[PDB]
Structures are given as C-alpha cells and as structure tokens.
C-alpha cells in the first residue's frame, strides 16, 4: 500500500495472508467471508505468463495477523486448503477479467476478536455505495513504493468515474472491474501495490453499520503513479458464481 498508514489492531479482522510453503513467502492478500471460505484474486494462484499455477498443497492461509513477518503465536490461525476454485472465465490472457477465486479451508476456523468475516454485498448495498466519490478502504502487507511494511497498512480511496478509469490506460476495462484512487488534481495519494493483490476493498454501510467487501485488489500499472488508478474485481457482479460454488461444494 502506498501512502497508507498502519492499521489498528482488529481493524480488518477478515484480512487473510496467502503464504507459500517453500519458499516461505507472502504471496497475496485474501479475505475471510465465512468460517470455511476465503476469497482472493485468481491471478494469485494461476498466471501462466509467469508460470504461476499453485495447488492446494503449495499454500497456507494465515488469518488474524497484524505483523507481516512474525508468527503471531496465540493470535493468528494457519489453515490448509481443501479445494481451490478459480472463476471458469478468468481471463489471464488479456485483462484479468473475472480475477476471483474461492478457497475452501480444510477445517473451519474459530472467530475471535482478530478473526471475523466480512459481508458480501447485496444488489441494494452495491447500488447505494459503489458511486464515484465514495471512499472505500484497502488493506495489505504489499510494497510501500513501486520497502515493505512491518504491519498491515490501510488507505481509503475514492471510487472513480468509469470514463476516467478507461481514459487512464490502454487495457480494456470490463463491467467486472472498477478503479479507485485520487486524481492528479486532488492533492491526496494512495494505492495498493505488489503484494496487495487478492486483498479486500471494503466500505462501511451507513444504513446498518456493517462492512462489505465491494472489491478485490486486481491490478494497476505501477503504484500510485499520477494519472493511473488501481483496478479491483467487482464482487457483486460475480456473486452468483460465489453463491454457486459455495452451496454446490459446502458453506
């Protein structure tokens, strides 16, 4: 996260870390949506251009963390994966369209003051909150510049008007993506960066006080460059796929 601050303890209890076993390294961010399911970006698991194709057995999910490199004994939980489901139409060849994946944990995790699931939006919440100018929050242990943080970082970014998003790149934007960030002319900065992929973009409903995950960190061209924005997967538009694998393969 660039130009963000350290998070507070228990500020994002749904934040997850996808950790590789060998080498033992942070791979991506992810989020907890129930006691047995994690949501992340499909490119974190499959990206053939760079020969990336991970299997259950190669990953570990660390939940309840704050510190990036320490094993937070008695606070975090490490789970193994039972199954990984990538969106059948994830487009890694052209623009990472439908960059979403679900991971089923081997065993359910128990919630605590540091482990709690985020809500997935419903048509109405998406409708009222995904408006240009409204700010959302992104969290992650990714790069600070285009070193790394010791603690989870957070930054609040405004959603941008879709034309502005399309006119900032040469990549074809789809309705399954939205972009966020400040305009060169807004004197504020911030963006996600390498290592933040897969993590959550959330908003707090002023109607019922709950936090909803509206997006997943997907891509950007550089980090916090002026005139560019970060792109996020539109969770609500892919929710029927989510519903389907969950009630087709578990809960």
């Amino acid at each position: 996260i660039v130009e963000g601050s350290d998070a507070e303890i228990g500020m994002s209890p749904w934040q997850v870390m996808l950790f590789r076993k060998s080498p033992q390294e942070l791979l991506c961010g992810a989020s907890l949506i129930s006691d047995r399911w994690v949501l992340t970006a499909a490119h974190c698991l499959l990206y053939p251009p760079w020969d990336k194709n991970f299997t259950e057995n190669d990953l570990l999910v660390r939940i309840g963390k704050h510190s990036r490199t320490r094993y937070e004994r008695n606070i975090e939980k490490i789970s193994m994966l039972e199954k990984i489901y990538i969106h059948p139409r994830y487009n890694w060849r052209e623009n990472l369209d439908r960059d979403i994946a679900l991971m089923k944990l081997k065993k359910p995790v128990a919630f605590s003051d540091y482990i709690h699931p985020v809500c997935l939006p419903d048509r109405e919440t998406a409708a009222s909150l995904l408006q240009a100018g409204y700010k959302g929050r992104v969290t992650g242990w990714g790069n600070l510049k285009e070193g790394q943080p010791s603690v989870l970082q957070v930054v609040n970014l405004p959603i941008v008007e879709r034309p502005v998003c399309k006119d900032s790149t040469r990549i074809r934007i789809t309705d399954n993506m939205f972009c966020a960030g400040y305009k060169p002319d807004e004197g504020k900065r911030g963006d996600a960066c390498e290592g933040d992929s897969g993590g959550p973009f959330v908003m707090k409903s002023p109607f019922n006080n709950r936090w909803y995950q509206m997006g997943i960190v997907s891509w950007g061209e550089g980090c916090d460059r002026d005139g560019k924005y970060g792109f996020y997967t539109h969770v609500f538009r892919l929710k029927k796929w989510i519903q389907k694998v969950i009630d087709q393969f578990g809960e």
Binding site: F19, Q24, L60, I78
Partner: peptide
C-alpha cells in the same frame, strides 16, 4: 524475512 512457523502446518 519471515519468521519460522510451526512444522505441524507444513507436514
């Protein structure tokens, strides 16, 4: 840079 995690989680 990461700290070692308990062997039981690799196995």
């Amino acid at each position: 840079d990461f700290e070692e995690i308990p062997e039981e989680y690799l196995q």
